[PDB]
Amino acid sequence: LAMALAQAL
């Protein structure tokens, strides 16, 4: 989850 968000932003 943390990674998904980091990449999205």
Give the length of the chain: 9
Decide: helix, strand or coil at residue 1. coil
Distance from chain centroid for Cα 3: 4
Around Cβ 9, how many Cβ atoms within 10 Å?
5
- DSSP letter at 8 equals H
4: which 2 tokens?
């998904």
- DSSP letter at 3 equals H
What Å resolution does this PDB entry report? 1.1
Percent of the chain as helix, strand, coil, to the nearest 5? 80, 0, 20
3: which 2 tokens?
């990674």
2: which 2 tokens?
């943390």
Give the number of C-alpha atoms closer than 13 A to the C-alpha of residue 4, restricted to the C-beta side: 1
